[PDB]
Design an enzyme around this catalytic site. Structure first.
Site, short mmCIF file in Angstrom:
data_model
loop_
_atom_site.label_atom_id
_atom_site.label_comp_id
_atom_site.label_asym_id
_atom_site.label_seq_id
_atom_site.Cartn_x
_atom_site.Cartn_y
_atom_site.Cartn_z
N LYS A 1 47.29 -138.70 6.89
CA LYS A 1 48.08 -139.12 8.03
C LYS A 1 47.65 -140.50 8.48
CE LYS A 1 47.93 -134.27 9.48
NZ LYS A 1 46.52 -133.87 9.17
N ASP B 1 44.86 -130.47 3.79
CA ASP B 1 45.39 -131.29 4.88
C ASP B 1 44.27 -132.13 5.48
OD1 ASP B 1 47.72 -131.91 6.75
OD2 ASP B 1 46.07 -131.47 8.15
N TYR C 1 40.05 -137.43 11.37
CA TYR C 1 39.14 -136.29 11.27
C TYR C 1 37.73 -136.71 10.89
CZ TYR C 1 43.53 -133.62 11.26
OH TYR C 1 44.78 -133.13 11.53
N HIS D 1 51.03 -139.53 12.11
CA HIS D 1 50.29 -138.43 12.74
C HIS D 1 50.91 -138.04 14.08
CE1 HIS D 1 45.92 -136.65 12.88
NE2 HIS D 1 46.76 -135.82 13.46
N1 LIG Z 1 49.17 -132.93 12.84
C1 LIG Z 1 48.41 -132.65 13.90
O1 LIG Z 1 48.51 -133.25 14.98
C2 LIG Z 1 47.41 -131.53 13.78
C3 LIG Z 1 46.89 -130.92 14.93
C4 LIG Z 1 46.08 -129.80 14.80
C5 LIG Z 1 45.77 -129.32 13.55
N2 LIG Z 1 46.24 -129.96 12.45
C6 LIG Z 1 45.87 -129.47 11.08
O2 LIG Z 1 45.99 -128.06 11.06
C7 LIG Z 1 44.73 -127.45 10.72
C8 LIG Z 1 44.61 -126.07 11.33
O3 LIG Z 1 44.64 -126.15 12.78
P1 LIG Z 1 43.32 -126.06 13.67
O4 LIG Z 1 42.15 -126.61 12.93
O5 LIG Z 1 43.70 -126.65 14.97
O6 LIG Z 1 43.09 -124.50 13.91
P2 LIG Z 1 43.32 -123.09 13.21
O7 LIG Z 1 43.47 -123.28 11.71
O8 LIG Z 1 44.38 -122.40 13.93
O9 LIG Z 1 41.93 -122.36 13.57
C9 LIG Z 1 40.66 -122.82 13.05
C10 LIG Z 1 39.61 -121.95 13.69
O10 LIG Z 1 39.81 -120.58 13.27
C11 LIG Z 1 38.62 -120.09 12.68
N3 LIG Z 1 39.00 -119.19 11.60
C12 LIG Z 1 39.56 -119.54 10.40
N4 LIG Z 1 39.85 -118.53 9.62
C13 LIG Z 1 39.45 -117.42 10.36
C14 LIG Z 1 39.46 -116.05 10.08
N5 LIG Z 1 39.90 -115.53 8.93
N6 LIG Z 1 38.96 -115.21 11.02
C15 LIG Z 1 38.49 -115.72 12.15
N7 LIG Z 1 38.43 -117.01 12.53
C16 LIG Z 1 38.93 -117.81 11.58
C17 LIG Z 1 37.86 -121.32 12.20
O11 LIG Z 1 36.45 -121.01 12.14
P3 LIG Z 1 35.45 -121.60 11.02
O12 LIG Z 1 35.99 -122.94 10.55
O13 LIG Z 1 34.12 -121.71 11.74
O14 LIG Z 1 35.41 -120.59 9.91
C18 LIG Z 1 38.17 -122.29 13.34
O15 LIG Z 1 37.38 -121.99 14.48
C19 LIG Z 1 43.74 -128.50 11.21
O16 LIG Z 1 42.43 -128.30 10.69
C20 LIG Z 1 44.41 -129.78 10.71
O17 LIG Z 1 44.25 -129.87 9.29
C21 LIG Z 1 47.05 -131.03 12.54
C1 LIG Z 2 45.38 -131.07 19.74
C2 LIG Z 2 45.60 -132.54 19.93
O1 LIG Z 2 46.25 -132.96 20.86
C3 LIG Z 2 44.96 -133.38 18.95
C4 LIG Z 2 45.20 -134.92 18.65
C5 LIG Z 2 44.05 -134.45 17.68
C6 LIG Z 2 43.30 -135.24 16.74
O2 LIG Z 2 43.48 -135.32 15.54
O3 LIG Z 2 42.32 -135.90 17.35
C7 LIG Z 2 41.49 -136.75 16.51
C8 LIG Z 2 40.41 -135.93 15.93
C9 LIG Z 2 44.91 -133.16 17.38
C10 LIG Z 2 43.42 -133.69 18.90
#
Ligand SMILES: NC(=O)c1ccc[n+]([C@@H]2O[C@H](COP(=O)([O-])OP(=O)(O)OC[C@H]3O[C@@H](n4cnc5c(N)ncnc54)[C@H](OP(=O)(O)O)[C@@H]3O)[C@@H](O)[C@H]2O)c1
Ligand SMILES: *CC(=O)[C@]12C[C@](C(=O)OCC)(C1)C2
Length: 299
Positions: free
Chosen positions: A77, A43, A48, A110
């Protein structure tokens, strides 16, 4: 089943690697490790600021003969400053150039809100409010549909669209392609039951973002809840001899959702993939759903 059939006939891997907040200098290794361990879905997003480095990883794994392109499912996106119909194709081509790809498997709007076009990702005014653009999601959708016709993307979809916004697309006069996916925030504190049921009833697959609660999100505060440290969820994990993160990834999978946990840490990338060897019980699922508090990482 490790993939879910989309309404364009393609199969989308139910686990993907998230890349928001993955630094350019670390995301190449993260994507390489993810592909090695079995991830086939990445993704991405222009905002980003790391698509070039994601693309380097993909190219290296193609060159190594670890995977072929048709085995990968690459999502990106369209950012809010490119909602004008005349800017959508250029935004997509820039993403394809950065990723070093000929096509995307899925391209998402997005956010439903268009921002003033220009050289600022987030144009703000004195009131702290965003400067919007004179755009609407139906005209932007028509421009997204053109990308399918041109062969730049295999599927188009939406992100952060509520029920009414999904309905506006589905009722669009002249609609050519339905959204294949709606990517929304979803986890035990924001379970999205009604929006998910609606999308699924219309044949739109839902991807759950921030499934771990985005603990690395900017502006996290010590008073905020923490899914990974929630003792109720730790108790479910202990019952299954899994980690809390593994429970939080398996949870959406059992709701027929795609899920995209983010990590740059090789051990965690691997741990997060080890979610195909256990099942949460019906009561585990009901209990996790009962934790909803409509609490959003992304407001
Ligand atoms: N469409 C949108 O508006 C939107 C918004 C938010 C997110 N997204 C997408 O969704 C993805 C995931 O959401 P997110 O990045 O917000 O957060 P998330 O996947 O819920 O959490 C990421 C965090 O969790 C940690 N982590 C990962 N695996 C772990 C494990 N096994 N044990 C402990 N900690 C762990 C990571 O640390 P480390 O990386 O340091 O290992 C990082 O700090 C994003 O990266 C993006 O691709 C899209
Ligand atoms: C969580 C929220 O609200 C958000 C929007 C975002 C992005 O992507 O920015 C640029 C980097 C997800 C923060």
């Amino acid at each position: 089943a490790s993939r879910i059939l989309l309404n364009n006939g393609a199969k989308m891997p139910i686990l993907g690697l998230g890349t928001w907040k993955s630094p350019p200098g670390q995301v190449t290794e993260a994507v390489k490790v993810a592909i090695d361990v079995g991830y086939r879905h990445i993704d991405c997003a222009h905002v980003y600021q790391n698509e070039n480095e994601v693309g380097v990883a993909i190219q290296e794994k193609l060159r190594e003969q670890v995977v072929k392109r048709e085995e990968l499912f690459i999502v990106s996106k369209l950012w809010c400053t490119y909602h004008e119909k005349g800017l959508v194709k250029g935004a997509c081509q820039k993403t394809l150039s950065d990723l070093k790809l000929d096509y995307l498997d899925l391209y998402l709007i997005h956010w439903p809100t268009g921002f003033k076009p220009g050289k600022e990702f987030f144009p703000l005014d004195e009131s702290g409010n965003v400067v919007p653009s004179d755009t609407n999601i139906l005209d932007t959708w028509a421009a997204m549909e053109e990308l399918v016709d041109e062969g730049l993307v295999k599927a188009i979809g939406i992100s952060n669209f509520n029920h009414l916004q999904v309905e506006m697309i589905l009722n669009k006069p002249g609609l050519k392609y339905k959204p294949a996916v709606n990517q929304i925030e979803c986890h035990p504190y924001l379970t999205q039951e009604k929006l998910i049921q609606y999308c699924q009833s219309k044949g739109i697959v839902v991807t759950a973002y921030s499934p771990l609660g985005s603990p690395d999100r900017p502006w996290a505060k010590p008073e905020d809840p923490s899914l990974l440290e929630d003792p109720r969820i730790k108790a479910i994990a202990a019952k299954h001899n899994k980690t809390t993160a593994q429970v939080l990834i398996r949870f959406p999978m059992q709701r027929n959702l795609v899920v995209i946990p983010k990590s740059v840490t090789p051990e965690r990338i691997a741990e997060n993939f080890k979610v195909f060897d256990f099942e949460l019980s019906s009561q585990d699922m009901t209990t996790l759903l009962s934790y909803n508090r409509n609490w959003r990482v992304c407001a």
